[PDB]
C-alpha cells in the first residue's frame, strides 16, 4: 500500500470490525471497542460501486451482430473476415485485461488514501493534546471516556478544553 497505510504504519487490519471498511478502536477506562466510520465508508462504497458500474455501463454500445458465411471459392474473403474478428479479439482481450489491472491498482491505493485521510483528520483535530505512537495509534495526554470519543468521530473535539491538562501532563513526562 502506497500511502503508508496498509503496507505501512497500520500493520494488519482489524478483523474484529464488521461495521464497515474503515474505523476506530478505543481503549479507554470503561473498556474497549470498534465502531466503524460512516461518511468515509459510505463515500467509498459509492465510489467503488460507481467504478464497477461505469466500466459496465459505458459499453452500452453494443448492438445486433453475427456468425459465418462464405463458400470455398470465397476463401480470400473468409480470411478477410477472420482477420477482422481475430483483430477485434486481440483488441478487446488486451484492453479488458489491462483495464482490470490498472483499475485494481488504483482501487487498492484509493483505500490506502482514505485510511491516511482518516488518520490525518484525527491527528489534526487534536494537535498536542495527544501522543503519536506510530502504530497508527494515538495516546491521549489526558483521560477520556466513551462520550468523549463521540466528538472525536463527530469532528467536534475541543482543543482548548484539555490543553492545560495535557500541557502540565507533558512536562511531567519530560525529564
Amino acid at each position: 500500500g502506497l500511502f503508508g497505510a496498509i503496507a505501512g504504519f497500520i500493520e494488519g487490519g482489524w478483523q474484529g470490525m464488521v461495521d464497515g471498511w474503515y474505523g476506530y478502536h478505543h481503549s479507554n477506562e470503561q473498556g474497549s471497542g470498534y465502531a466503524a466510520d460512516k461518511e468515509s465508508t459510505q463515500k467509498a462504497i459509492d465510489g467503488v460501486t460507481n467504478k464497477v458500474n461505469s466500466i459496465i455501463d459505458k459499453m452500452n454500445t453494443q448492438f445486433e451482430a453475427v456468425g459465418r458465411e462464405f463458400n470455398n471459392l470465397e476463401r480470400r474473403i473468409e480470411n478477410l473476415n477472420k482477420k477482422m474478428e481475430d483483430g477485434f479479439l486481440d483488441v478487446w482481450t488486451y484492453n479488458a485485461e489491462l483495464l482490470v489491472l490498472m483499475e485494481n491498482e488504483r482501487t487498492l491505493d484509493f483505500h490506502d488514501s482514505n485510511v491516511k485521510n482518516l488518520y490525518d483528520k484525527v491527528r489534526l483535530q487534536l494537535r498536542d493534546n495527544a501522543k503519536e505512537l506510530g502504530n497508527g495509534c494515538f495516546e491521549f495526554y489526558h483521560k477520556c471516556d466513551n462520550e468523549c470519543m463521540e466528538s472525536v468521530r463527530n469532528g467536534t473535539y475541543d482543543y482548548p478544553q484539555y490543553s492545560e491538562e495535557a500541557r502540565l501532563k507533558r512536562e511531567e513526562i519530560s525529564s
Binding site: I6, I10, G12, G13, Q15, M17, V18, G20, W21, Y22, G23, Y24, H25, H26, N28, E29, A36, V48, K51, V52, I55, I56, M59, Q62, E64, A65, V66, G67, R68, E69, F70, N71, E74, F88, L89, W92, T93, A96, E97, L98, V100, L101, E103, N104, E105, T107, L108, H111, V115, L118, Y119, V122, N135, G136, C137, F138, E139, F140, K143, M149
Partner: protein, 322 residues
C-alpha cells in the same frame, strides 16, 4: 493516557485480484466482469423463435426434399439453425446457384408463406407425375423434391412450354427452378424428345437462358445426371415468364416473403428450449450484463464483447491479508 486508533476492515475473504504492479492480492470484496454462464439451449431472439432445420440444409428444406418436410409452417423467424453436416441436402445430386446469398437473405424473415405458383396438375401436355428417382426415396417408393416438378415428355413429344405468373400479392416472392443436365444423348431423348434444348426465364430484372450440359460424370446417390437450381425475388407488380423446350424443373410452390432485417445461419447441434434472450450462442443463450464473455465467438444478438481470458476480476474491497 487514552487512545483512539484508525484501522480498516478485514474479513474471512480469500478472493485474489491482480494489479498492474502486483499479482495474487487478497481482497475484501470483488466483482467478476466476465460472463462465463450460458444455458445450453437455443432461444428466441427478442421473443422471436429461430428456424431450426433439424437434419436439413436450407436447400433441402426449400426444395421439397422428401425426407425433410414442409412442416416449417412457422411464419416468421429471427435466425436459422443448421447442423454442422445436415444429412438431407440435394437428394438428387446437383448445384444451387448463389446458395449462400440466398441463405443469408433467409436468415431472418418477418413473414413467410408458401404459395402454389404453378400447380402440378396444369401440365396437360407434359408428364408431371413421372419425374421421380431412387436418389430421393420417399417411403421406399422413389420420388423427388416436393416444391418443384420434374417434367417429362408425354406420348413422344415435348411441346415448347410458354408460361408465366404475375405476382399479384403485395409481398415480394421468392421463386425457384432447375435444369436437368442428363448424362448422355440417349437419356436426353428418353426424357424429352428434343435433342437441343433451353430454359429461358425473364423478369423485369432477370434475363436468363439455360442450356443443359451433357457429360459423363460420376454417380452420386447412383446418379450421374445433375440438377442445377436458380432463384429470384419477384417484385410485387412484376411477372416471371418461363419458356422451355425441355430440361425444365418447374416451380410448383414459391414463397411470399417480407424481409425487414438481416441475421445469419448458426451452426449448432442444440435443440430449442422454450425460452428467450437478447444474445444467442451455438453452445447456448447468454443472459448478459457483463461487458465481456468468453463463451463462443459466433454469436447472434446484442452481446458482451467476446474475449480470451478466464478472469476479469475487479477489486471492490481492500487488502484483506491475514
Amino acid at each position: 493516557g487514552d487512545q483512539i486508533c484508525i484501522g480498516y476492515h478485514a474479513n474471512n475473504s480469500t478472493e485474489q485480484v491482480d494489479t498492474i504492479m502486483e499479482k495474487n492480492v487478497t481482497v475484501t470484496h470483488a466483482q467478476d466482469i466476465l460472463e462465463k454462464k450460458h444455458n445450453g439451449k437455443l432461444c428466441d431472439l427478442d421473443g422471436v423463435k429461430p428456424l431450426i432445420l433439424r437434419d436439413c440444409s436450407v436447400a433441402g428444406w426449400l426444395l421439397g426434399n422428401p425426407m425433410c418436410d414442409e412442416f416449417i409452417n412457422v411464419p416468421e423467424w429471427s435466425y436459422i439453425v443448421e447442423k454442422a453436416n445436415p444429412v438431407n441436402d440435394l437428394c438428387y445430386p446437383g448445384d444451387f446457384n448463389d446458395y449462400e446469398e440466398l441463405k443469408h437473405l433467409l436468415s431472418r424473415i418477418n413473414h413467410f408463406e408458401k404459395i402454389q405458383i404453378i400447380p402440378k396438375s396444369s401440365w396437360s401436355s407434359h408428364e408431371a407425375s413421372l419425374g421421380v428417382s431412387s436418389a430421393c426415396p420417399y417411403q421406399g417408393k422413389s420420388s423427388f423434391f416436393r416444391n418443384v416438378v420434374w417434367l417429362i415428355k408425354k406420348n413422344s413429344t415435348y411441346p415448347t412450354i410458354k408460361r408465366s405468373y404475375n405476382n399479384t400479392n403485395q409481398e415480394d416472392l421468392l421463386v425457384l427452378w432447375g435444369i436437368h443436365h442428363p448424362n448422355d444423348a440417349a437419356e436426353q431423348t428418353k426424357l424429352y424428345q428434343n435433342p437441343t434444348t433451353y430454359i429461358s426465364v425473364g423478369t423485369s430484372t432477370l434475363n436468363q437462358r439455360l442450356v443443359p450440359r451433357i457429360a459423363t460424370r460420376s454417380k452420386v446417390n447412383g446418379q450421374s445426371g445433375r440438377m442445377e437450381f436458380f432463384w429470384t425475388i419477384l417484385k410485387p407488380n412484376d411477372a416471371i415468364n418461363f419458356e422451355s423446350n425441355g430440361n425444365f424443373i418447374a416451380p410448383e410452390y414459391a414463397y411470399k416473403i417480407v424481409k425487414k432485417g438481416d441475421s445469419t445461419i448458426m451452426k449448432s447441434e442444440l435443440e430449442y428450449g422454450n425460452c428467450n434472450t437478447k444474445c444467442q450462442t451455438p453452445m447456448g443463450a447468454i443472459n448478459s450484463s457483463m461487458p465481456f464473455h468468453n463463451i463462443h465467438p459466433l454469436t447472434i444478438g446484442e452481446c458482451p464483447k467476446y474475449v480470451k481470458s478466464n478472469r476479469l476480476v475487479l477489486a471492490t474491497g481492500l487488502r484483506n491479508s491475514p
